[PDB]
Design an enzyme around this catalytic site. Sequence first.
Site, PDB file in Angstrom:
ATOM      1  CG  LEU A  87      -2.657  -0.833   1.165  1.00  0.00           C
ATOM      2  CD1 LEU A  87      -2.881  -0.290   0.310  1.00  0.00           C
ATOM      3  CD2 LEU A  87      -1.860  -1.936   1.133  1.00  0.00           C
ATOM      4  CD  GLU A  90      -0.207  13.457   3.749  1.00  0.00           C
ATOM      5  OE1 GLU A  90      -1.631  13.504   3.313  1.00  0.00           O
ATOM      6  OE2 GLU A  90      -0.023  14.246   4.229  1.00  0.00           O
ATOM      7  CG  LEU A  91       6.506   8.959   5.106  1.00  0.00           C
ATOM      8  CD1 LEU A  91       7.478   9.106   3.979  1.00  0.00           C
ATOM      9  CD2 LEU A  91       6.791   9.525   5.922  1.00  0.00           C
ATOM     10  CG  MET A  92       1.003  10.311   8.327  1.00  0.00           C
ATOM     11  SD  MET A  92       0.135  11.319   7.223  1.00  0.00           S
ATOM     12  CE  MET A  92      -0.444  12.690   8.326  1.00  0.00           C
ATOM     13  CE  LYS A 139      -5.254   1.595  17.038  1.00  0.00           C
ATOM     14  NZ  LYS A 139      -4.258   0.579  18.183  1.00  0.00           N
ATOM     15  CG  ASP A 156      -4.177   1.852  10.203  1.00  0.00           C
ATOM     16  OD1 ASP A 156      -4.360   1.166   9.650  1.00  0.00           O
ATOM     17  OD2 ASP A 156      -3.948   1.298  11.770  1.00  0.00           O
TER      18      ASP A 156
HETATM   19  C1  LIG Z   1      -7.155   6.515   3.240  1.00  0.00           C
HETATM   20  O1  LIG Z   1      -7.080   4.778   3.317  1.00  0.00           O
HETATM   21  C2  LIG Z   1      -5.936   5.113   3.968  1.00  0.00           C
HETATM   22  C3  LIG Z   1      -4.355   5.440   4.594  1.00  0.00           C
HETATM   23  C4  LIG Z   1      -4.257   4.964   5.517  1.00  0.00           C
HETATM   24  C5  LIG Z   1      -4.223   2.707   5.375  1.00  0.00           C
HETATM   25  C6  LIG Z   1      -4.861   2.443   4.710  1.00  0.00           C
HETATM   26  C7  LIG Z   1      -5.049   1.241   4.369  1.00  0.00           C
HETATM   27  C8  LIG Z   1      -6.579   0.246   3.904  1.00  0.00           C
HETATM   28  C9  LIG Z   1      -5.960  -0.475   4.196  1.00  0.00           C
HETATM   29  N1  LIG Z   1      -6.882  -1.695   3.422  1.00  0.00           N
HETATM   30  C10 LIG Z   1      -7.520  -2.802   3.918  1.00  0.00           C
HETATM   31  C11 LIG Z   1      -8.683  -3.113   3.379  1.00  0.00           C
HETATM   32  C12 LIG Z   1     -10.000  -4.355   4.008  1.00  0.00           C
HETATM   33  N2  LIG Z   1     -10.661  -3.643   3.253  1.00  0.00           N
HETATM   34  C13 LIG Z   1     -11.490  -2.927   3.841  1.00  0.00           C
HETATM   35  C14 LIG Z   1     -12.021  -1.355   3.296  1.00  0.00           C
HETATM   36  C15 LIG Z   1     -13.179  -1.563   2.087  1.00  0.00           C
HETATM   37  C16 LIG Z   1     -12.774   0.066   1.624  1.00  0.00           C
HETATM   38  C17 LIG Z   1     -13.402   0.379   2.029  1.00  0.00           C
HETATM   39  C18 LIG Z   1     -12.527   0.992   3.603  1.00  0.00           C
HETATM   40  C19 LIG Z   1     -11.820  -0.150   4.131  1.00  0.00           C
HETATM   41  C20 LIG Z   1      -8.382  -2.491   2.309  1.00  0.00           C
HETATM   42  C21 LIG Z   1      -8.551  -2.548   0.420  1.00  0.00           C
HETATM   43  C22 LIG Z   1      -8.286  -2.293  -0.389  1.00  0.00           C
HETATM   44  C23 LIG Z   1      -6.937  -1.498  -0.452  1.00  0.00           C
HETATM   45  F1  LIG Z   1      -6.381  -0.615  -1.165  1.00  0.00           F
HETATM   46  C24 LIG Z   1      -7.025  -1.167   0.987  1.00  0.00           C
HETATM   47  C25 LIG Z   1      -6.760  -1.723   2.054  1.00  0.00           C
HETATM   48  C26 LIG Z   1      -5.301  -1.708   4.744  1.00  0.00           C
HETATM   49  C27 LIG Z   1      -4.377  -0.837   5.737  1.00  0.00           C
HETATM   50  N3  LIG Z   1      -3.670   0.378   5.509  1.00  0.00           N
HETATM   51  C28 LIG Z   1      -6.067   3.471   3.998  1.00  0.00           C
HETATM   52  N1  LIG Z   2       1.138   7.440   6.915  1.00  0.00           N
HETATM   53  C1  LIG Z   2       2.470   6.839   6.992  1.00  0.00           C
HETATM   54  N2  LIG Z   2       3.633   7.255   7.877  1.00  0.00           N
HETATM   55  C2  LIG Z   2       4.075   7.233   8.486  1.00  0.00           C
HETATM   56  N3  LIG Z   2       4.561   6.002   9.012  1.00  0.00           N
HETATM   57  C3  LIG Z   2       3.404   5.365   9.120  1.00  0.00           C
HETATM   58  C4  LIG Z   2       1.960   5.975   8.605  1.00  0.00           C
HETATM   59  N4  LIG Z   2       1.333   4.748   8.850  1.00  0.00           N
HETATM   60  C5  LIG Z   2       1.346   4.427   9.946  1.00  0.00           C
HETATM   61  N5  LIG Z   2       2.742   5.086  10.351  1.00  0.00           N
HETATM   62  C6  LIG Z   2       3.748   4.033  11.007  1.00  0.00           C
HETATM   63  O1  LIG Z   2       4.229   2.697  11.267  1.00  0.00           O
HETATM   64  C7  LIG Z   2       3.943   1.736  12.653  1.00  0.00           C
HETATM   65  C8  LIG Z   2       2.670   0.858  11.847  1.00  0.00           C
HETATM   66  O2  LIG Z   2       2.154   0.936  13.514  1.00  0.00           O
HETATM   67  P1  LIG Z   2       0.245   0.235  13.187  1.00  0.00           P
HETATM   68  O3  LIG Z   2       0.005   1.531  12.128  1.00  0.00           O
HETATM   69  O4  LIG Z   2      -0.463   0.836  14.945  1.00  0.00           O
HETATM   70  O5  LIG Z   2      -0.040  -0.628  12.757  1.00  0.00           O
HETATM   71  P2  LIG Z   2       0.364  -1.777  13.883  1.00  0.00           P
HETATM   72  O6  LIG Z   2       2.071  -1.496  14.550  1.00  0.00           O
HETATM   73  O7  LIG Z   2       0.184  -3.861  13.586  1.00  0.00           O
HETATM   74  N6  LIG Z   2      -0.934  -2.224  14.960  1.00  0.00           N
HETATM   75  P3  LIG Z   2      -1.430  -1.432  16.256  1.00  0.00           P
HETATM   76  O8  LIG Z   2      -1.393  -2.540  17.256  1.00  0.00           O
HETATM   77  O9  LIG Z   2      -1.964  -1.005  17.023  1.00  0.00           O
HETATM   78  O10 LIG Z   2       0.693  -0.880  17.227  1.00  0.00           O
HETATM   79  C9  LIG Z   2       3.867   2.443  13.552  1.00  0.00           C
HETATM   80  O11 LIG Z   2       5.015   3.209  14.221  1.00  0.00           O
HETATM   81  C10 LIG Z   2       3.295   3.572  12.699  1.00  0.00           C
HETATM   82  O12 LIG Z   2       3.231   4.981  13.421  1.00  0.00           O
HETATM   83 MN   LIG Z   3      -1.850   1.876  13.628  1.00  0.00          MN
END
Ligand SMILES: COc1cccc(-c2cc(-n3cc(CNCC4CCCCC4)c4ccc(F)cc43)ccn2)c1
Ligand SMILES: Nc1ncnc2c1ncn2[C@@H]1O[C@H](COP(=O)(O)OP(=O)(O)NP(=O)(O)O)[C@@H](O)[C@H]1O
Ligand SMILES: [Mn+2]
Length: 260
Positions: A87, A90-92, A139, A156
Amino acid sequence: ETKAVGMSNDGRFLKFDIEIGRGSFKTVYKGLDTETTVEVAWCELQDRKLTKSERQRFKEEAEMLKGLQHPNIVRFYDSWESTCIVLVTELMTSGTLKTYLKRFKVMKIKVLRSWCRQILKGLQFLHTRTPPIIHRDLKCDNIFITGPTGSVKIGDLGLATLKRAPEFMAPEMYAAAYDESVDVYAFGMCMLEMATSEYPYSECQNAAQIYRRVTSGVKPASFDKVAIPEVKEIIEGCIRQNKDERYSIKDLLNHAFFQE
Ligand SMILES: COc1cccc(-c2cc(-n3cc(CNCC4CCCCC4)c4ccc(F)cc43)ccn2)c1
Ligand SMILES: Nc1ncnc2c1ncn2[C@@H]1O[C@H](COP(=O)(O)OP(=O)(O)NP(=O)(O)O)[C@@H](O)[C@H]1O
Ligand SMILES: [Mn+2]
Ligand SMILES: [Mn+2]
């Protein structure tokens, strides 16, 4: 330049061997997009062994996620298969909100009102989509500080679902028919640890003890430490057991606290 240890199909996102965050299924590296010149979070999860239909539906969901575009939501650029699933968002770089709280005990009422308001706008955006999106894992660790202004973004969406538009249903099936009010309940807990700098229900060892306290009307020990009465009432209306008696996002934005 092309230091990239990973590949982009069209040649747009380059993966560098710089791990920015490590998790359960989420290993996020530091990427880069050569088109909008934004540093990009290169995230890759365990290989999902899904059928010829669920490999399909992930694709249509990914282009749904690209349609989302809100200043209080981390942007979703693209996604693709590679060997697992990678996936790209955007980077935070300013960390999450929870770590921002792990270092101070009192948050200014200005910052709390501002950041909480932006969280509600993010939740409202997700809930006004068609079909509406329910975050389900809200959260402070999934809310990020961003920019010079210090605005907040919600990221997320892994455990998110679409709003789903029997007779002798069992009690757990009546609870399975929840809705957006699960994000309002999660907002109340977020605002609670933003005003107390303390993890809610930290006195509990597991979810069993937590569930037994909520249904019995027992709030976290940290709830009685909220100095601001108006804030204390907002949290109250968000973490009620009956979902039908919880605040609505529209009423929270129209609350005197967030219109101030
Ligand atoms: C702005 O959106 C963001 C920003 C940051 C992280 C993520 C993200 C998404 C996923 N992610 C989870 C699913 C599962 N289906 C649930 C899904 C169905 C459609 C409506 C939303 C929920 C999934 C399906 C397709 C996909 F491209 C990514 C997907 C997993 C981990 N981070 C998404
Ligand atoms: N878009 C993003 N940009 C920069 N860092 C991110 C981004 N998304 C997630 N991270 C970091 O990547 C790491 C993964 O953590 P997280 O998203 O909580 O997944 P996880 O640790 O498996 N689930 P949890 O039990 O909620 O901590 C964390 O340290 C986040 O701060
Ligand atoms: Mn998370
Ligand atoms: Mn109410």
